[model samples]
Target: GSHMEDFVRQCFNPMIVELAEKAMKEYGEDPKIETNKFAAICTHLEVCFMYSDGGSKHRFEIIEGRDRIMAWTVVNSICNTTGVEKPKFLPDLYDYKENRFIEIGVTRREVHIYYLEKANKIKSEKTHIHIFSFTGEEMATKADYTLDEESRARIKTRLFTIRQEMASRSLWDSFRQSE
Candidate 1:
């Protein structure tokens, strides 16, 4: 037997919900309930993934769904990249009230979302991101490009970019705000 109930109550419920609530408060608008709902769906699949049994087939299904929602959330974040540009208040609109959906259209937003979607799909297949890193070829390259000041700077730049991308797309704020 699985511990779906325990997982939801103890782990997924608190962590995911809290993250979403915080994000909602920081980025979301008024009619807080609407913000909460948006956050829920945005982080819903992740919560499902967290609670699901990784060994089961449904686990991959849930993870795939989670990846989609994550991509959408990232898309939304990029859409509102310019802080001056107000985010759409679609969550507060009457028609989409009960539906619980978020918007995902625009140039920069769509690009990142689509990239993430493709990456997630690939991940499901390969189960690894740095296939070359694990192989001797990467180590051989590393030996040739020994660590130097320039190399260190390049590594730092890459790390910074990765961090920036993650922070921009996270949903933890949604949960904190709803608290």
Candidate 2:
């Protein structure tokens, strides 16, 4: 096996599972509780890997739906818990508290909520970001992009314009943010 493969097999995977078992035991008894805890633990590991990267990368298999949301929650929780810096908000904006999503710039005068997202069928699948207006006044917009490198790069460029536009319009008194 290669260096990463051998280390992942002998040391990384074993320690991770043991730590995850301890975590799952404490995380409570909802249905699929352990699975959820494991999701969060795996998320924390991803953060660690990315932050300490020193180069190279990973994430072979994927999880979606509730697990996706759980991964988001996991990342945020661990940042606060472990004093790791927050992950860069690369693409989609999420509002977990309000159970909504906020993404932007489909039109000049509109607010967008990217919701009901699903992974489409079969191998080499693409993800569909099901979007609706803030008020659901119009029909939803379905954006199809493969959930790989291109999907994220596509979002990054799109967000760049939206973010830059917002910066152009900002004023201290009008747009106050807590530190």
Candidate 3:
């Protein structure tokens, strides 16, 4: 039974679990109570991928479902082309509360949350949460393309654009602010 539990936990996707844990901690919520809700949300979570090589890059937004394998594949391809390894986890760069972007890394991974309307309504939530992650030297080569100026600039621009777009839609109100 413990092995089964371990397997189940492993299937939860580390990135998704990290975001949920962060939310619970920030809100001073009881993990015992919130864990289920967080897990429920994870089932329908969507993650976006962006890769910038300074001059040219690819952005794949609205991945549309909770397929972790596909996400890994996309991330691996990005890392391969960028000369970095697919990071197990990335740094969160944006301040959910400030309605502004922060530079936490040269290479960025931004995750946007959207739930099925029925689920959203049931959860009494309509606002989307944007989670950011980054690849650092811990998971990449010593050269660390993320340390390059062009990569940093591109990441900053991408984050700003996403923030602006969210603000225009009035979705900024739904963000979880940083303390």
Candidate 4:
């Protein structure tokens, strides 16, 4: 209803914008890609966390380290959930090793990207990666895959760096507040 819509606009919308800006910085923006395309894809990005007791599903907050870990755990869990081995490489046009929940695809005339994450409990005892194409293809019908070892390692290293940066930012924020 309107309540949930308001929540999405207030909470989820900023997350998508942050991620898109991050992607543009990392992969370079293409002029051909329209804002509406991203808006459509953002609508499909849903994250859910399960309780240890398996009681209820809750909305996940994609913070720095927490969300990165959740993304890794979810990708790993997808293997078990779907009974498929981890993919050595990502599919489609990109053809690069899988790294994080964020992925980018680009052609001469268009750009595509996606982000996914899911987990259960604090440490991610159970997780799942809900897959969707940049073009808005839903899961269940989409193809499944996993990350290669090197890509996994790269993702871990990046996450570590992000964690340290977040810590530093927290310290600076607190220090500035004291003044």
lDDT per residue as tens, model 2, 63-116:
211234565675566446645445443113332322223222221224332132
- Scored by TM-score, the top model is 4
What candidate 3 gets wrong by more than 4 Å, as runs, is: 1-49, 52-147, 177-179
Superior candidate under TM-score, 3 versus 4: 4
Output the lDDT of residue 92, model 3.
Answer: 23
- Model 4 per-residue lDDT tens digits across residues 1-179: 32222322443457665554454444465313433333322332322111111111222222221234454465556556655455333221111133223222211111122222222211231223433222223232133434333433443343334334434545323312321
TM-score: the better of candidates 1 and 4:
4
C-alpha RMSD by candidate, in order: 18.8, 19.7, 17.0, 18.0
The C-alpha lDDT values of all candidates are 0.32, 0.33, 0.36, 0.32
Candidate 1: segments with Cα more than 4 A from true spot? 1-12, 35-39, 42-45, 51-179
Higher-ranked by TM-score: 2 or 3 = 3
User: In model 3, how large is the Cα lDDT of residue 62?
Assistant: 27
Error of 1 at 156 (Å): 40
Ranking by TM-score: 4, 3, 2, 1
Candidate 2: worst 10 consecutive residues by lDDT? 119-128
TM of each candidate vs. truth: 0.21, 0.22, 0.27, 0.27
